[PDB]
Amino acid sequence: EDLRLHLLLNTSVTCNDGSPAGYYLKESRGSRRWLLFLEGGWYCFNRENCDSRYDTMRRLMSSRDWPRTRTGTGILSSQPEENPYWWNANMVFIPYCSSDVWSGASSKSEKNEYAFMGALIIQEVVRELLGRGLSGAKVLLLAGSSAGGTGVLLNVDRVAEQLEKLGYPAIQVRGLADSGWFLDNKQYRHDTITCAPTEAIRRGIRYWNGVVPERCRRQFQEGEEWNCFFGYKVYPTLRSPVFVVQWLFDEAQLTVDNVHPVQEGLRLYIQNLGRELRHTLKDVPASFAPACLSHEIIIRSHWTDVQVKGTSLPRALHCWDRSLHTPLKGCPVHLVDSCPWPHCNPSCPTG
Ligand SMILES: FC(F)(F)c1cc(-n2ccnn2)ccc1Cl
Ligand SMILES: *[C@@H]1O[C@H](CO)[C@@H](O)[C@H](O)[C@H]1NC(C)=O
């Protein structure tokens, strides 16, 4: 259990129920690389569906029952056999306890039953880590899976601005967004369960006092900031380098699309979803998008097994690092499958 819990010293920065937020840390004294990982786990967007989440997903809304340690897995592992990419880095796991896709800036108060502080949690973790060795870093990689991957897209440029304003312009801030690149597409068939993500995010932003990156906000303007939660719309507005990992047939995407022998209508729907996803990645130079039906990858212990065009994700990330020192021979960073059906790639996770 190699990462140790630290609750935030600023106890005004809280989980949904007012308990302090926090982070799990494993330092690597001989390293100037820092990996800050944002946990996922959907979201809630009104009193009734947040109350239900508090009953059966309470660790996603409160720190009162968190364990003192967590084991680092996948990209958070310190063993080179499990993590060829960054096994020697300083490792930070930030639990998701704000239910706001890491976008909120609202406290619990006489008018708010819950606090939605995801964007402030990230900034306060960064602030407190500067005193624990981050001040010496060369690279800060903000990574995340699922809602945490969307959280990377929403917060990577604000972390860069924070460090510049605090006096640390030499720390290179980068993002790694895993399974958080969603499409606001037409559902296959069309309350909490009946609310499409565009409408649920629109309501969430108001409930959370949600915030989005500045350039994206200026493009879409008031009332339309929900657009910035969709990767293909927010990514072109970002200045920090961001590596995008996305299954072409993501299970959470299919869930919001109301998809579960496949006949022609659904066959064409699935094939068109894969084609649309591949199209949105055409101009993303650092990306890894295998043709599999799955969800999340980078903190799985067997994350090294999947390959696109014969290149694994830890290798692609290493090639990305090299590229950030014109292309590299045999060290690709843009890896998007072209085959049109789940598991047409033989290295897909077996389940
Ligand atoms: F696809 C959606 F629904 F749009 C989407 C899905 C999530 N999600 C799923 C699991 N964890 N977070 C978050 C934001 C968005 Cl935008
Ligand atoms: C604590 O965090 C709050 C909320 O982000 C911030 O406004 C304030 O500057 C911090 N206060 C203290 C006492 O650290």
Side-chain angles (χ1 to χ4, degrees), residues 152-185 187-189 191-221 223-228:
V152 170
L153 296 172
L154 293 171
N155 289 279
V156 63
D157 278 4
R158 188 172 301 108
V159 173
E161 169 185 18
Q162 186 205 12
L163 290 174
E164 190 283 345
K165 279 176 186 171
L166 289 170
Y168 297 100
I171 303 180
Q172 300 187 57
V173 178
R174 307 172 180 173
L176 174 55
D178 166 33
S179 297
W181 185 273
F182 299 104
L183 302 184
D184 51 344
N185 65 341
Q187 301 183 304
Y188 177 65
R189 290 196 177 94
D191 206 17
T192 302
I193 55 159
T194 57
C195 201
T198 59
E199 185 53 44
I201 293 297
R202 186 164 197 151
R203 293 173 194 262
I205 290 170
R206 309 194 76 259
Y207 192 53
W208 309 326
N209 202 4
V211 294
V212 300
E214 175 173 62
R215 180 171 290 99
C216 194
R217 181 171 68 238
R218 287 172 170 168
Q219 291 177 1
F220 288 100
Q221 313 196 305
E224 298 285 328
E225 290 104 329
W226 65 266
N227 283 275
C228 299

Side-chain angles (χ1 to χ4, degrees), residues 5 13 19 24 36 45 52 70 80 84 144 193 200 226 231 260 267 276 310 314 329 343 350:
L5 175 65
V13 181
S19 57
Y24 290 80
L36 277 64
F45 61 90
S52 289
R70 288 185 64 108
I193 55 159
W226 65 266
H260 305 285
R267 177 172 61 250
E276 289 174 319
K329 183 156 70 149
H343 227 318
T350 62

Side-chain angles (χ1 to χ4, degrees), residues 40-43 101 146-147 150 182-183 197-198 201 229-230 252-253 256 295:
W42 292 97
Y43 50 87
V101 198
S146 197
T150 310
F182 299 104
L183 302 184
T198 59
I201 293 297
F229 281 63
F230 288 86
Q253 179 75 49
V256 294
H295 181 58

